[PDB]
Amino acid sequence: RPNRLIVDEAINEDNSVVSLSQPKMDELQLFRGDTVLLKGKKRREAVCIVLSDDTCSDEKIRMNRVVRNNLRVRLGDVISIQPCPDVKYGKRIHVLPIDDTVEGITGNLFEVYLKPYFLEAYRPIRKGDIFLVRGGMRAVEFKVVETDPSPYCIVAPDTVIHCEGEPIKREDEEESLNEVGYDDIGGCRKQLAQIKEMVELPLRHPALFKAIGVKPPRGILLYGPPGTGKTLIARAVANETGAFFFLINGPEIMSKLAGESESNLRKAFEEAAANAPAIIFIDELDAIAPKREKTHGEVERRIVSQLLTLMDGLKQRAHVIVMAATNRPNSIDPALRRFGRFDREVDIGIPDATGRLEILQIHTKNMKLADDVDLEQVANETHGHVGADLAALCSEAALQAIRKKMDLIDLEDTIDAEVMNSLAVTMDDFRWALSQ
Amino acid sequence: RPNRLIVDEAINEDNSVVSLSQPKMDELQLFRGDTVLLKGKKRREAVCIVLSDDTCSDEKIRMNRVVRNNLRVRLGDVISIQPCPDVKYGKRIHVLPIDDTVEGITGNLFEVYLKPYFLEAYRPIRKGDIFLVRGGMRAVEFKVVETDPSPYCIVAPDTVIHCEGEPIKREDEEESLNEVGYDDIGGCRKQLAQIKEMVELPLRHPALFKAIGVKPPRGILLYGPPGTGKTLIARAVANETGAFFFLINGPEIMSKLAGESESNLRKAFEEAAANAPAIIFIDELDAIAPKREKTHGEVERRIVSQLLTLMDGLKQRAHVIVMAATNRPNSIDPALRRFGRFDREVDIGIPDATGRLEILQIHTKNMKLADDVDLEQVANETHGHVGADLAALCSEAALQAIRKKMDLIDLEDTIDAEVMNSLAVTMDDFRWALSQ
Amino acid sequence: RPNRLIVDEAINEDNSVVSLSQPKMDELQLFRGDTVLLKGKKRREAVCIVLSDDTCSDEKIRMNRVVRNNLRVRLGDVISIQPCPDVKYGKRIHVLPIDDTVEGITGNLFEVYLKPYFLEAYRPIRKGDIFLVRGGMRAVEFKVVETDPSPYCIVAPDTVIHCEGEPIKREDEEESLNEVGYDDIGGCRKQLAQIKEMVELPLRHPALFKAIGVKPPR
Ligand SMILES: Nc1ncnc2c1ncn2[C@@H]1O[C@H](COP(=O)(O)OP(=O)(O)O)[C@@H](O)[C@H]1O
Ligand SMILES: Nc1ncnc2c1ncn2[C@@H]1O[C@H](COP(=O)(O)OP(=O)(O)O)[C@@H](O)[C@H]1O
Ligand SMILES: Nc1ncnc2c1ncn2[C@@H]1O[C@H](COP(=O)(O)OP(=O)(O)O)[C@@H](O)[C@H]1O
């Protein structure tokens, strides 16, 4: 059908906007800025604004996770689109925050989140939507409980927005937007793309490997210096593909008594296989399986052997992918790179200046930046920096902003765990941080 | 006398401004902005504008080299000051460029240098003054041939400025401002101060060491990575103290036939001693006298020996100081760090961020910078950089400015060796250079 | 001022073709496939076929070295372009090989080089042009001695193409196309670009470094 499209990653960071190719909108007869009605899985719908995108495939639609969540679908799934000509300016909408996103937040909610979020934006909303509003170094989720023209409308300047009391509980299928996704990863476009390919069939179409006798990858080794976002990638790939995630921390395993280590490795692979499709992530692999000579222990050599055995003991394995992070290829036992094991490697390098910028935007999404803040500038003075450095930078900048305001606040009493929304991080804060 | 002051270095880079202490100006009854007549040696006079400096001491006057040259005086000499209440707005002045400063310059001298230099500035000038105007990546010197009033006047908006044809020859005592001076050295405050102490008496008061039997330093070893400005320091100290300068380049000596090396070392010390007070600078000392083991030759060992001999053969001498540069203490033969020889060592380190800024201003003095150019910014993104790096940076910036304008210029014909005065180096040029 | 362009490297490997930006041809009112007259240094002219190029800057013209040589200009120099509406199918042209390019060649020059080179191609040529024909693991240069409609024409199927023996000597300013050029360097795009930058001002505008005191790389 022409109205069926494949879900793809957003370029436009605004949660209300989905993107089509110029040709596709032509074909579907959709106006730039039109309100469209999206149909997903489990009888879910979403309403969004449609815009053209030059880079979008003709058969794909780009949407943010917020809308993917609302439609209960994942990247690569199929949605249907159709114009929404009947959509009315809403008389009144009722929204409530999800409890787990508003712990600690002692603000107005309406004045701090909702009012600025909706103001003059003409956002469409549908009853039962969860949307996200960022601010005050948090990101709060709200559920739309009622819209006056039901079940959807446009929040126009005259639309009354109600949020009368009592945060609501999170239902089971409602994944938190605080979960890691691809949108949380900057400057890895190329490698993240490879990893997604490798994993697509095994994790999203597992039934295939029962129907054919072709071998998908089993083990993927992510290498690169500390703080490059290897843990982040693995976690994200799991979340996005809806696979079960099992973390094995090198040091955590090695901290255990001889024997309770091997018992823990075993339990990890068993639990993965039980909950497949699944990803096992082995953080700090070199702690567990260092270069064959670097081990001096005898229990140490037994642990690495136990790991090789466990890798080999993964056949079709239902559909379990093992991902592991390490500093360098040569830091680990070469027997791990043997064929049935870690046979795929991906280099997560130091980010470039464009990547640095993406990372800086990711780690500032929930801050209020002054107008004088130039992230591209901060990008340019941080050549050596990896993701973890940049995140620390933004964190140091923000905490400096807070200290500057803290003497002022203590004196005219201590609003303290508030006023963090009116606070803005200035370029002076970043300079301060950049020289520390 | 209170009209008698010691010549010190300038903080204001205007070559028309001389700075005194509030108290002294009070004492001498001088108005901030007043024209003062300065008297020095060889019956040379100079008219300058007097301002105040918190750092200047009551006994000292701060002036730029331009004015020290005009007064035939050097740092530490004694000048006399007096108000100039009779000074008139000039009717007409006549100036000519010094030939050696205008080779290659195919501009309109008046339109490009003189007009902007004098315009609305109210500069005093005195017949027989040489002044310097910077611009178009050059610095041109002019001599004042005639002033209408008297021997001096103020160049007021109505003063007619003549420069009718024919660059003039440089007289003997007229030192080029293209010579290296302390104003060409950035970010060495502490060390430059030590070296100046060491040579003050030997080079400026040589008659003393005939009257007493105390030993001044003979050899000074400047240490630090390449491009830190060791050659520059030695050259500057020579020029400023009026001493004779003799360069010995390590590689140049070692490039000679066995025997012509030793003959060249000898000729260097002989010529120094003949023209004392003098500085001998040995650039790249480790090329001539490397660690005792690093030499393999037999003629090589003869050269090092020859050097030890020559230096130990310089007692108070005709007042000859020997300076030598090397990367590290340990790179050279320990016998050279002897007691009658290189017994004083001074570390010329990597410059800090303040130093980096001074260097960047030094290497931009003759460029036109756009308003968007922030040198302090360039200072901050060049931590590792040494002076030689920063000079290359400015050079790369300027050449990029020129290339951008070169396509445009070739097309609407090729002013070429001109229009370089209207050209301005932009922050975009520096960014381009900073990422290369 | 609109007809003056900056010489740039060829993308189209055919020595007859120069390339302009789409906008520029619009501006100059030139037909795709038109014969154009190029004016260079030392009162030299060339005639070429003009085609559009999407990647060519609006102020630049792309040409192969053959044409740069004929115009006595180099990359970055300035030429002028203008349409050539009067150009006629030539009755007869006379070409001779340059001696130094034909030592050892004991072939039929016409049958082996000229005939295939001109055949049904509609190449424009101007008296005093040197052109290059490749073949038999060698590349021969020819000089155009005479064209019937003088001084330029199109070599049409009916144009009689004469050699008439006796290779000619190479004049001084006539650089061999056997010389190395950027044309003979593959797979160095990025680095060749850097080196060209470094060297541009010092080598092509040397008069500058007498006028200013900035240091180019050495
Ligand atoms: N590419 C990146 N994009 C966004 N944030 C990043 C990136 N790399 C690192 N970070 C941030 O720094 C932290 C450190 O990264 P981490 O997942 O521990 O990487 P690694 O496992 O390679 O040490 C992350 O949790 C994240 O907040
Ligand atoms: N402190 C400095 N101030 C100004 N220019 C400097 C400085 N240090 C280095 N430079 C620049 O670098 C150039 C080369 O340095 P040079 O004088 O040879 O020092 P070194 O002998 O230690 O290499 C100088 O001519 C000057 O242009
Ligand atoms: N990038 C290249 N493009 C075209 N030909 C090349 C290239 N590199 C090498 N060659 C060929 O191989 C020969 C040997 O290259 P040469 O210039 O001697 O390189 P090098 O100095 O690095 O050895 C060249 O003359 C040329 O024929």
Swiss-Prot record, chains A, B:
Outcome reported for the amino acid change (mutating residue 293 to A): Does not affect methylation by VCPKMT
Modified residues (N6,N6,N6-trimethyllysine): 294
Keywords carried by this UniProt record: Acetylation, Amyotrophic lateral sclerosis, ATP-binding, Autophagy, Charcot-Marie-Tooth disease, Cytoplasm, Disease variant, DNA damage, DNA repair, Endoplasmic reticulum, Hydrolase, Isopeptide bond, Lipid-binding, Methylation, Neurodegeneration, Neuropathy, Nucleotide-binding, Nucleus, Phosphoprotein, Transport, Ubl conjugation, Ubl conjugation pathway
Phosphoserine PTM sites in chain numbering: 16
EC number annotated for this UniProt entry: 3.6.4.6
Enzyme class: hydrolase
The reaction(s) this protein catalyses: ATP + H2O = ADP + phosphate + H(+)
Effect ascribed to mutating residue 158 to R: No effect on binding to DERL1
Location of Phosphothreonine modifications: 414
Impact when changing residue 162 to W: Severely reduced binding to DERL1
Effect of substituting residue 164 to K: In CMT2Y; normal ATPase activity; impaired autophagic function
Result when mutating residue 134 to C: In IBMPFD1; also in one patient without evidence of Paget disease of the bone
Family: Belongs to the AAA ATPase family.
Name this protein carries in UniProt: Transitional endoplasmic reticulum ATPase
Source organism of this protein record: Homo sapiens
Span of the entire protein shown here: 22 to 458 of 806
